[PDB]
Design a protein around this ligand. Structure first.
Ligand SMILES: COc1cc2c(cc1OC)[C@H]1Cc3ccc(OC)c(OC)c3CN1CC2
Ligand SMILES: COc1cc2c(cc1OC)[C@H]1Cc3ccc(OC)c(OC)c3CN1CC2
Lengths: 183, 183
């Protein structure tokens, strides 16, 4: 649909030009009038919230399928989630570049945040037992996600530039992320 | 001099368009012919190395002056260095955006890396006792710097967007950086 085209154009524009990207640019790049964009997303805020759910789901749905019926401890599940996320961002640079800006956005609604939290219950539960309490507070939750994405971004940058050592940067990134964010 | 203008234009271009930025763009933005740029920096590699020393020194020289004749432990000195760095990046976004790309560049020479290491001996010594050994290895030194800059960047982004909580994001960033990078 045009909706998927819009979502893709919004991913590219936000990855490239930041979360501030124009609805005009986004509409133009999807090959539609801006008025058409507005029929699908009345507000930039709606677009941020919908795009974030769509991109989060793009990664999360494949991860849920891979992990299903495994028995993991907290750290194992979290390492799988981290390695999966780096793979996804390597495969889909713009998706990662857009999502890490969306996830820390002031414009996310409580409903959206709750949907993201509950999309993968097994992981939510593991994170609740593992994440430093400060980074599950209303005030600092987005900052803890930001730090994850920052470390993930660095990891992807080194893995892409020096693919010979990709797994080493992913493991070292994971280890630093774990220390930085867990109890 | 034109050299300072070139360094400033190279800071802006690299911050904006990445370490890949054109010598033509850089020369144009400094108001000189590209041939003139080449009289000051024969190679893009020379420009990366010189710009990185210049920007590192821009922060480090003021930090050395502030810390002089203090008695600090490792962690105190490192917290001062981190808070100083966030202040600098808030005051000088392009300087931070350029430097974090320069510092992980494959084009840095051994001489440059050694000059950066030795510019502030007291801090070098403290870091040698504090930094995880992996992040002082030849192979992963740049990756450990990258992770620092990533966490610093996130911290600056939240401190700039939500200045009411700047010190809280700086302290939480510092705490995560410390866990991620130290023994
Ligand atoms: C787009 O796909 C994802 C992105 C993210 C996630 C999970 C995702 O897929 C399921 C998780 C994964 C994760 C790991 C470890 C954490 O702290 C120890 C953590 O809290 C800060 C977080 C919270 N989220 C960070 C961003
Ligand atoms: C541009 O100015 C600076 C940038 C940086 C530095 C110091 C600087 O000014 C003196 C230091 C500060 C610092 C802290 C803690 C570290 O690990 C615990 C560390 O190793 C990774 C590093 C290494 N460098 C990161 C980048």
């Amino acid at each position: 649909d045009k909706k998927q085209a819009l979502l893709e154009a919004a991913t590219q524009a936000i990855a490239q030009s930041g979360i501030a990207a124009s609805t005009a640019v986004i509409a133009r790049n999807a090959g539609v009038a801006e008025g058409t964009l507005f029929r699908y997303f009345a507000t930039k805020d709606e677009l941020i919230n919908t795009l974030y759910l769509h991109l989060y789901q793009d990664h999360c749905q494949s991860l849920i399928m891979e992990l299903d019926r495994s028995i993991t401890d907290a750290k194992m599940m979290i390492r799988f989630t981290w390695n999966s996320y780096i793979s996804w961002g390597l495969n889909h640079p713009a998706r990662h570049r857009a999502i890490r800006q969306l996830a820390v956005s002031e414009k996310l609604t409580k409903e959206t945040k709750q949907r993201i939290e509950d999309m993968f219950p097994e992981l939510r539960d593991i994170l609740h037992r593992s994440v430093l309490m400060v980074f599950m507070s209303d005030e600092y939750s987005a900052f803890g996600k930001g730090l994850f994405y920052a470390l993930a971004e660095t990891t992807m940058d080194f893995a892409a530039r020096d693919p010979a050592r990709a797994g080493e940067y992913i493991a070292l990134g994971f280890e630093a992320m774990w220390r930085a964010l867990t109890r």
